[PDB]
Structure formats: C-alpha cells, structure tokens
Amino acid sequence: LFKSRDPKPLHLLDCIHVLLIRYVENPSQVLNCERRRFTNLCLDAVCGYLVELQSMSSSVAVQA
Amino acid sequence: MFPHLLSPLLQLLRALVSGKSTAKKVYSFLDKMSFYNELYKHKPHDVISHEDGTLWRRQTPKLLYPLGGQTNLRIPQGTVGQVMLDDRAYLVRWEYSYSSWTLFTCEIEMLLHVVSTADVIQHCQRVKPIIDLVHKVISTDLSIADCLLPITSRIYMLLQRLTTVISPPVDVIASCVNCLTVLAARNPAKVWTDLRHTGFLPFVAH
Numbered sequence: 001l002f003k004s005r006d007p008k009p010l011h012l013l014d015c016i017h018v019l020l021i022r023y024v025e026n027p028s029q030v031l032n033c034e035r036r037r038f039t040n041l042c043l044d045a046v047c048g049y050l051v052e053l054q055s056m057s058s059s060v061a062v063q064a
Numbered sequence: 065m066f067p068h069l070l071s072p073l074l075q076l077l078r079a080l081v082s083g084k085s086t087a088k089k090v091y092s093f094l095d096k097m098s099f100y101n102e103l104y105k106h107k108p109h110d111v112i113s114h115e116d117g118t119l120w121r122r123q124t125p126k127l128l129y130p131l132g133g134q135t136n137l138r139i140p141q142g143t144v145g146q147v148m149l150d151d152r153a154y155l156v157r158w159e160y161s162y163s164s165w166t167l168f169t170c171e172i173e174m175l176l177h178v179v180s181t182a183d184v185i186q187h188c189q190r191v192k193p194i195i196d197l198v199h200k201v202i203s204t205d206l207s208i209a210d211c212l213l214p215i216t217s218r219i220y221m222l223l224q225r226l227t228t229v230i231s232p233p234v235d236v237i238a239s240c241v242n243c244l245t246v247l248a249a250r251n252p253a254k255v256w257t258d259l260r261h262t263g264f265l266p267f268v269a270h
Contacts, residue, residue, distance in 0.1 A: 004261050055270045 003042070013040040020045065027061050067167075068101040068155060070190040078197040081204045091205065094164040100139075102128075104147070104154035105183055112144075119146045121156075129170065132180025137162065137170065165201070168194050169214030176221060188232050195219065195239035203246035210250060219243050220258050227263060 002012050017040030024030040034045050046057075066073035081090050111121035123145055128137035139160040146157040172194065174180045198219075202212050223240040226233055248255045259265060 016040045023061070026063065029058060029061075065101050067184060067190075068103065070187075071193060074190075074193040074197050078193065078200045081197075082200055087204060091201065094201065096161060097164045097167075098159070098161045100158040100160045100162055100167075101148070102156070102158065102184060104156040106154065109145075118150050119148075121145050121147070123158075128183045129174060130181045132174065132177065135170065137167065165198065165212070165214045168198070169218065172215070172222060173218045176218070176225060188236060191222075191236045192232070192239055195222075195236065195243055199239060199242040199246050202243070202250070206246065206249055213247065213250070215243065216247065216251070216254070219247075220262075224263050 002009065002016065005012075017038065020035070020038060020040070024032075024035055034048075037043075038045050077090060077094065081087060084090065105126070109121060109123045109126070111117065114120060121144070122141075123139065123143045124141040126139055128139070130136075139158065144159045147154065148157055149155040171182060171184050172191065174182050175186050175191075195215075198215055202209060205212050219240055223237065223244075226237055226240065228234065228237070244255055244258070
C-alpha cells in the first residue's frame with residue numbers, strides 16, 4: 001500500500017511504524033536495537049534483514 | 065447507429081486510421097462527432113411535428129451521466145433528436161456534437177465505479193474494440209501523441225481490475241497492453257512506473 005501509492009500517506013507510514021513496533025516486541029525473535037531509529041519509511045528494518053539473510057521470516061506470527 | 069451499435073463504427077475507424085494518411089479527416093471525425101446514437105431514457109422531452117413524427121423531437125437539457133462527479137455529459141436543450149427504430153426500443157439519434165475520444169474516456173471509467181450511472185450501457189465486448197481504437201489512434205498519430213490521450217490512468221486501472229481467466233476479457237487485456245505500448249513513446253516514464261506495480265509481471269516480491 002505504501003509503495004504502491006503515488007502519494008503523502010503519512011497515516012500509513014505511522015501505522016506501519018506502530019505495527020513494526022508492535023510486532024518486534026511481541027515475538028522475541030525479531031527483538032532489539034535496529035528499530036528504535038525506525039520511524040517508518042522505506043527504511044524497512046526487515047527489508048534490510050531480508051536482503052542479507054533471506055526472505056524467510058519464519059512461521060506466521062499471530063497476536064496472542 | 066454508434067454508439068448504439070458500437071462494433072461497426074469503431075472497427076471501421078480503427079482500420080482506416082492505421083492505413084490511411086488521411087488521419088486528419090478520420091481523427092477530426094473522432095474529435096468532432098456530429099452525431100450520437102443511444103438508447104433513450106424515458107419520457108418528457110418536447111417533440112416538434114411534421115408527418116406523424118415519431119422521428120422528430122426537440123430536447124431540454126439532459127445528462128448522459130447522472131450524479132457521480134461533476135464531469136458529466138450534458139446536452140443543451142434545443143438539440144434535435146430522432147426516434148430511429150420504433151421497434152422494441154426507444155432508440156434515439158442525437159444531433160449533439162461531441163468528442164468520441166473524450167466521451168469514451170468517460171464511459172469506461174464509469175464502468176469501474178458503478179457510482180455514476182450511465183445512459184450509454186456497459187459491456188465487455190465494446191471494451192475490446194474501444195481500447196484498441198484508442199490504441200490504434202494514439203499509435204498512428206504518434207508524434208502528435210500528446211494531445212491525443214483522454215485515457216492515461218483509467219486504462220491502467222482497468223487493466224488491474226480487468227485481470228480475468230476468461231476469453232472475452234482476456235482479449236480486452238490485450239487491448240490494454242496495446243494502449244500501454246502505444247502510450248510508451250509519449251510518456252515513457254509513466255509506463256514504467258506503472259509496470260513497477262503491474263500485477264502481471266511482479267515476480268520480485270518473492
């Protein structure tokens with residue numbers, strides 16, 4: 001949604017920002033420092049992670 | 065008969081444009097179309113008489129497209145119209161001069177939303193020749209491409225939504241691609257930006 005839209009989507013950026021923050025805390029797997037800096041942009045922490053290690057996140061993570 | 069009979073007029077125009085250097089007469093025709101033929105919405109509009117005239121009548125204002133965006137096709141009153149068939153339908157000829165390309169590039173868009181309502185009437189088959197004509201016209205005109213496009217963005221939207229596992233729409237999909245190809249020379253950056261998120265290709269996502 002982020003990339004696809006030609007536009008401002010300030011809202012999406014914020015929410016995704018909240019989403020990533022929500023996600024990392026929930027699983028221990030993602031947890032830590034490269035993150036706090038993140039204030040949603042195409043500065044995807046995961047994106048960087050994917051490039052180096054691989055796309056394989058893991059199994060689906062769901063909210064408890 | 066057009067647009068009431070969509071296929072013949074559109075097809076003939078398309079074929080001629082490519083072949084003939086007399087692009088201007090055909091093209092000018094599309095930009096300036098003296099006649100409009102469509103189904104008739106119902107009832108009160110005035111009629112003028114001679115003979116028992118189912119044929120002749122006069123109009124007050126009418127909107128081809130009812131509420132769904134300001135952009136609307138309204139035909140001023142005083143325009144003459146005729147009731148052609150008198151058979152099974154209220155089919156009327158309208159003297160209203162309009163631009164075919166601008167008109168078509170309103171009709172298809174309405175198809176997406178369905179928000180607006182159209183006097184014209186919707187159908188997929190018409191879609192295949194309509195886009196192709198746009199495609200052919202732009203390609204043939206290519207040079208004086210810039211003036212020509214009423215359909216940049218809509219066509220792409222049509223393409224994404226259009227994606228079907230069906231023959232008639234599959235044919236339509238080809239037309240969309242064709243329009244894109246012709247469009248490419250005029251606005252190259254755009255086509256490419258479109259392709260970035262064109263549904264067909266993106267393998268990259270993983």
